[PDB]
Enzyme design. Structure first.
Site, PDB file in Angstrom:
ATOM      1  CD  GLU A 112      -9.315  -2.809   4.120  1.00  0.00           C
ATOM      2  OE1 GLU A 112      -8.268  -3.014   3.516  1.00  0.00           O
ATOM      3  OE2 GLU A 112      -9.370  -2.298   5.250  1.00  0.00           O
ATOM      4  CG  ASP A 165      -5.045  -1.672   8.211  1.00  0.00           C
ATOM      5  OD1 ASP A 165      -4.157  -0.859   8.542  1.00  0.00           O
ATOM      6  OD2 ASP A 165      -5.999  -1.239   7.531  1.00  0.00           O
ATOM      7  CE  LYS A 186     -12.667   3.297   7.980  1.00  0.00           C
ATOM      8  NZ  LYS A 186     -11.542   4.241   8.179  1.00  0.00           N
ATOM      9  CD  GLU A 220      -9.273  -2.288   9.212  1.00  0.00           C
ATOM     10  OE1 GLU A 220      -8.463  -2.020   8.316  1.00  0.00           O
ATOM     11  OE2 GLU A 220      -9.600  -1.423  10.097  1.00  0.00           O
ATOM     12  CG  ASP A 273       2.294   3.159   2.735  1.00  0.00           C
ATOM     13  OD1 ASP A 273       1.772   4.200   3.193  1.00  0.00           O
ATOM     14  OD2 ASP A 273       1.659   2.100   2.695  1.00  0.00           O
ATOM     15  CG  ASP A 318      -7.179   1.209  12.016  1.00  0.00           C
ATOM     16  OD1 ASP A 318      -8.110   0.581  11.541  1.00  0.00           O
ATOM     17  OD2 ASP A 318      -6.709   2.177  11.381  1.00  0.00           O
ATOM     18  CG  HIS A 327     -12.947  -1.237   8.182  1.00  0.00           C
ATOM     19  ND1 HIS A 327     -12.389  -1.272   6.909  1.00  0.00           N
ATOM     20  CD2 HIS A 327     -12.193  -0.374   8.875  1.00  0.00           C
ATOM     21  CE1 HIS A 327     -11.337  -0.500   6.887  1.00  0.00           C
ATOM     22  NE2 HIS A 327     -11.210   0.072   8.094  1.00  0.00           N
ATOM     23  CG  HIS A 377      -1.211   2.221   1.094  1.00  0.00           C
ATOM     24  ND1 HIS A 377      -1.051   2.027   2.451  1.00  0.00           N
ATOM     25  CD2 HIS A 377      -2.557   2.243   0.917  1.00  0.00           C
ATOM     26  CE1 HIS A 377      -2.229   1.940   3.035  1.00  0.00           C
ATOM     27  NE2 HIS A 377      -3.157   2.051   2.119  1.00  0.00           N
ATOM     28  CG  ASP A 405     -10.728   2.674  10.915  1.00  0.00           C
ATOM     29  OD1 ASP A 405     -10.856   1.540  11.411  1.00  0.00           O
ATOM     30  OD2 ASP A 405      -9.944   2.955  10.018  1.00  0.00           O
ATOM     31  CG  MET A 414      -2.210  -7.101   0.176  1.00  0.00           C
ATOM     32  SD  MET A 414      -2.032  -5.356   0.557  1.00  0.00           S
ATOM     33  CE  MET A 414      -2.414  -5.208   2.307  1.00  0.00           C
TER      34      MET A 414
HETATM   35  O1  LIG Z   1      -9.086   2.634   6.718  1.00  0.00           O
HETATM   36  C1  LIG Z   1      -7.837   2.392   6.091  1.00  0.00           C
HETATM   37  C2  LIG Z   1      -7.870   1.074   5.336  1.00  0.00           C
HETATM   38  O2  LIG Z   1      -8.070   0.044   6.279  1.00  0.00           O
HETATM   39  C3  LIG Z   1      -6.578   0.894   4.539  1.00  0.00           C
HETATM   40  O3  LIG Z   1      -5.417   0.824   5.402  1.00  0.00           O
HETATM   41  C4  LIG Z   1      -6.625  -0.341   3.684  1.00  0.00           C
HETATM   42  O4  LIG Z   1      -6.494  -1.510   4.488  1.00  0.00           O
HETATM   43  C5  LIG Z   1      -5.464  -0.230   2.728  1.00  0.00           C
HETATM   44  O5  LIG Z   1      -5.684   0.933   1.933  1.00  0.00           O
HETATM   45 MN   LIG Z   2      -7.583  -2.201   6.464  1.00  0.00          MN
HETATM   46 MN   LIG Z   3      -9.336   0.716   9.847  1.00  0.00          MN
END
Ligand SMILES: OC[C@@H](O)[C@H](O)[C@@H](O)CO
Ligand SMILES: [Mn+2]
Ligand SMILES: [Mn+2]
Ligand SMILES: OC[C@@H](O)[C@H](O)[C@@H](O)CO
Ligand SMILES: OC[C@@H](O)[C@H](O)[C@@H](O)CO
Ligand SMILES: OC[C@@H](O)[C@H](O)[C@@H](O)CO
Ligand SMILES: [Mn+2]
Ligand SMILES: [Mn+2]
Ligand SMILES: [Mn+2]
Ligand SMILES: [Mn+2]
Ligand SMILES: [Mn+2]
Ligand SMILES: [Mn+2]
Lengths: 393, 393, 393, 393
Positions: free
Chosen positions: A179, A291, A181, A215, A55, A255, A218, A52, A253, A86
């Site tokens: 993306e 991710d 969510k 994702e 980042d 992850d 998500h 990002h 979320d 990316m």
């Molecule tokens: O919930 C966070 C998202 O998954 C982000 O990390 C995107 O992948 C990139 O902005």
């Molecule tokens: Mn993501």
């Molecule tokens: Mn996530």
């Protein structure tokens, strides 16, 4: 296991770089230097790194600092061989993006978020990225009357189509990947699932260069079948990039590492990416991007363990999935269940709707009671996948 | 309250006709005669009635019985004035549809389900229906390897495009409306949400006459925002029909009365259907169809109470929603929150991506810290809707 | 509806004091001076204020600093008249608590956490609180092999019995209230629902002064019926405190204003708190505490609005719920549905098991098909409640 | 992996006997003769069979008929050697039970239900069952004002204490196992989770012989961690029976084969059943019972395959879980993460509360920032477990 650059495992800077601040506590780890990130990822077998804008470059950074940071960063990439496949923009941390970037109710913020994106496309092209991801994390609401729902989608389309036309205008060899969510950080996020994202792209002026970045976690936050959803993206030829991780249930979320969530689903996800469809069709040949976030309970040895673990899981699952499809008992089980039979068109070559209607054998004279006896043997077929997954066969 | 035919409240035969058999028990009510259904609905103020082919004509019925049944049914419609705005096909109860209709792994079943649909389009046109609904209830799987996910979508497209081409071929004044459902009866159903349904329609040859039939409860089964989802259907000009009911949480499809589920969401659903968008745009002008089931604990007096209750709830909510938008404190609250501001395009007339980038005031010289101070006052705006809903204002 | 101190509306300092930092972004509001929180809440009609040790006194606060802070805050209380009904401990924010306080795997940390709680009991006692709340936020795991699960409960028990033992020894007029939460911040939290909290209390040495502090949104994060959960807690006489807020489904802990979530559920919780059980039984008499967070989109005007919205929502629901039970039509409906017949014991006075099985009328010649004919009319009772809720009655 | 009677695999008659009727369609399989179920299960390696009164004996069965049926079924048992470890009552299928059995609003129905249970206790005793299971499927509501919630628990208590009292009086070697389920068939079911079941048991007169029968899929319908739930039940010594199956998320009760749902969770449940707690504690020793349903897509070959898949899945998970704990690498990882340190009491022998708060080392001079540095390495412990699961170790 043992991943190699040919495997195309890519990691975001924010993943291993995640210091542990969650909603109920502060960071449990020291900041990770980006040059240290590059060297460590490359040693582990990664192919590339993503980031990002904020980042790498602080929101505040002066022009002199941007260039200092980029020089060191470009040097490390050079030193190590990592590609940058990316690039994405942070349109969610700074207080200004509290109601969104592109769909912010404030018009001055919409302009500010779009310019931040446009500048970031320039860096993306400079870095050699092929994909520009867009995660609209603050685009949504907590309350149903906070937004004019039609206007929000018009403002989302304006941002995405301005960015796309800009790519086309400059001739950058870049595609936009949205993306989805369902929620978090917002109570309800616009384009909450793969479906909504796919549908939205069809209303765009520059839809040809816009695709998705699904994702695992998500889609699992809405209780959906991730393999089903990526299947539909692939089928539509819109699966431009992917984020792999783990999620255990409908909750925040998480992850987790890929494979530390819904294991059986991760297996079929890997079978779809590696093997594709049983009767043939499309294949996803982009990077295998992770991710995820290393659990806050663990120190830096857990950070590098977790990075490793993402890659191991994918390679372990890949192995079992190659064995499973190659297995002659599985292929016969598949034949029995009608997996290849679904590939046959329903209508005979040249038959019209009118023809099928009045074919007595397909309707009037059809024995529905006899056709219902068929043992599809889906349980047995499922049992063979699990045994292959368990390393039992 | 007091509904009148002008309100366009339509009910399915299977709703009030639902006898109570659920997964853990038998019917608790006697079968409802369809002619009794028509007379009772018309007395209550309904505008029309819908049905599934096998709701009226048994699967088994001989040609003589079909015509006997239809004559009585057409007589009752005549006697009472009810229209038949939507017709649908049962492609889920009979054992033959255990793996689906259109996406059945068995090719002979796919042909049988498609011919059943084609014949049903003929009755639909005969009845004066404007909408032909398609709910693919058995299209899906329990296990991820049961299906070739790309082939399933090719078989779904073949059925829908054959049916559509048939409508076009015959010049019937009919549209197809797909109805999404995340799960149940299948573990995972194809096209699980509004998004997936919308996206799928864009891949069709005859997409121009295909739209959706979203159902309150169904999107709520994936934890999605129903108003958000119908907003997107409307925005895409694909909201062809609607099923209104109640659902309390992610669990089995409850099909409660409209308003007996998520009340605040029902309120905003009614504001969107009646009032449309704050800055103007599309409107949904079709029927207000209730796809619900009268709780099995209750007898026939509960059946007619529940039918009444669907209509009352919608009219009570409509009233409160008209008062809310008309309220000058609400309009000022809306103005403050930037609801009208989101309607303004982001870019100035004629400004290019290049222009906005290099406009110092939109990026380089933007005060992000000052823009972040804005009080959006979304809480207060939510508070005004609830007070209007509570009949307090 | 205007709240008065007699209403017993309590607020945590962390609620209106919530700065806006979430997992995807930084604080949007400046820190709130505690002196100011006290004064503002006193002007709105709050009855009391609650806090966590570290909301008030920083973790690293020197003694001179602790004394000052306490001086300022006790001055504020004296000036305004605000009561301090509950005090709680922060065992989740510092990185030392990353694996829990009481059930951390590291023994030295468990010791520190228990010490930190004991000291806070002294403070709670000096502040005049009646309730001591324990929310074990970090007690749990992301992964199933991380904990010896029987050993995590022994460790939990040790900590809570030590705290209760100490209360008793010191002669404090304090009861402990455990607060369940299913997940977040941990993937799985120990004692995730009201059921688990009540169950664990029965294994305690000193369970007599240990009860619950259920939170609206937490039970809704598992999809349970909050009104049913607090009814079990009341029924067991273990409802010591309550945390009121709103949640819009199974997702991250939203902490919206009370009534800004599931509205009908909010209505029915208010009816239970105000009217008690229809056939009589225990009644809840503690504080009506709001553990919510002012959306981060809102500035400080929004903070006081939202504070106020909580008390307004509660008073509006109370007015409606009192009208609802006072309605003769509603009481008649209640009668018909058997709400009062549930209250009659099943057996007759001195009727034993054997007496009943041998009673012919009850079993052997009981006409089950005739009994099944009863129209419970639960739908109509529900419609009447909603109509009271919307104030259309 | 080949099951032997020593394994203690029990199956309900309703499981393999499930005909395929669901809410959207009719039975796909012919009825199963009970004599045949017994024989088939005996050939597969089942240890025992379980049933509901009405699975075996029809509701309206005459006495001559009841005797015949019992004769045939006891012959089968004698011929094969199958044990009957648990018997249960059907208080959900007949329309008389539409509002519950024990907590029905109608008193005559409550009486019938209790009579129906008492008679079934006699039968259970004559069949040699050790366990009597109660699944109150119809005990609950769709709507919040339908029940006096304190009165529903008194009514529940009355019924269960009457049944327990009767057991004691008769001298039967029977324990009662309550089985929670959050929803379905009712919108909300009383005592929805293991926590609620354990909590209620403590309010019973005769709770000593009343314990739980948790079901995998039911806890996952609320999104809870089933392994954590049975650990609480074990820890309280209340795990009398268990129902193993699979569930793929928060939705309708799927009743898939054990391991065909959440795989890692299945693994960790097996580890808990076989290996017990890492630091020791109670162990589960009853039947390993499968309450699943053969997908309706499958014919009778599928029924026996699925029956077999349950025992295979369990044996495969057992093999892996035994290898997992036997691994030195795994034991070392366990050590490092503090799995064995959790088992050490927090306090020292005869160390009181006061001793601890005054102990300087524990609080006053405890170095919290140094303690927080510990690398718990939960990720690596989790990776090792998955690697054992996939048999790559
Ligand atoms: O919930 C966070 C998202 O998954 C982000 O990390 C995107 O992948 C990139 O902005
Ligand atoms: Mn993501
Ligand atoms: Mn996530
Ligand atoms: O879940 C059932 C579906 O909602 C159907 O009633 C469609 O609306 C019509 O087939
Ligand atoms: O999830 C956060 C919790 O609800 C806290 O506010 C507790 O109520 C007290 O620590
Ligand atoms: O949801 C159905 C239940 O699980 C039953 O099979 C019980 O286990 C026994 O009535
Ligand atoms: Mn439905
Ligand atoms: Mn519907
Ligand atoms: Mn909360
Ligand atoms: Mn709380
Ligand atoms: Mn079940
Ligand atoms: Mn069960």
């Amino acid at each position: 296991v043992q991943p190699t650059p040919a495997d195309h495992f890519t990691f975001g800077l924010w993943t291993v770089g995640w210091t542990g601040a969650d909603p109920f506590g502060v960071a449990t780890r020291k900041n990770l230097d980006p040059v240290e990130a590059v060297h460590k990822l490359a040693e582990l077998g990664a192919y590339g790194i993503t980031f990002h804008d904020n980042d790498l470059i602080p929101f505040d950074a002066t022009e002199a600092e941007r260039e200092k940071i980029l020089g060191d960063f470009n040097q490390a990439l050079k030193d190590t061989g990592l590609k940058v496949p990316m690039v994405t923009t942070n349109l969610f941390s700074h207080p200004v993006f509290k109601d969104g970037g592109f769909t912010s109710n404030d018009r001055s913020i919409r302009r500010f978020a779009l310019a931040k994106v446009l500048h970031n496309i320039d860096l993306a092209a400079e870095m050699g990225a092929e994909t520009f991801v867009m995660w609209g994390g603050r685009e949504g609401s907590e309350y149903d009357g906070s937004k004019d729902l039609a206007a929000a989608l018009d403002r989302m389309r304006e941002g995405v189509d301005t960015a796309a036309g800009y790519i086309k205008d400059k001739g950058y060899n870049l595609r936009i990947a949205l993306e989805p969510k369902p929620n978090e950080p917002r109570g309800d996020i616009f384009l909450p699932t793969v479906g909504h994202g796919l549908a939205f792209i069809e209303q765009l002026e520059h839809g040809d260069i816009v695709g998705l970045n699904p994702e695992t976690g998500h889609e699992q936050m809405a209780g959906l079948n991730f393999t089903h959803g990526i299947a539909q993206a692939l089928w539509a030829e819109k699966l431009f990039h992917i984020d792999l991780n783990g999620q255990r249930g409908i909750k925040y979320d998480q992850d987790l590492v890929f494979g530390h969530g819904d294991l059986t689903s991760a297996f079929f996800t890997v079978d779809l990416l590696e093997n594709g469809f049983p009767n043939g069709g499309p294949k996803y040949t982009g990077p295998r991007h992770f991710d995820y976030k290393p659990s806050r309970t663990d120190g830096y040895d857990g950070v590098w363990d977790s990075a490793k673990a993402n890659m191991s899981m994918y390679l372990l699952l890949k192995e079992r999935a190659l064995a499973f499809r190659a297995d002659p008992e599985v292929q016969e089980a598949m034949k029995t269940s009608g997996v290849f039979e679904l590939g046959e068109t329903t209508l005979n070559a040249g038959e019209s709707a009118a023809d099928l209607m009045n074919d007595s054998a397909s309707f009037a004279g059809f024995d529905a009671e006899a056709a219902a006896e068929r043992n599809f043997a889906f349980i047995r077929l499922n049992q063979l996948a699990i045994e292959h997954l368990l390393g039992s066969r």
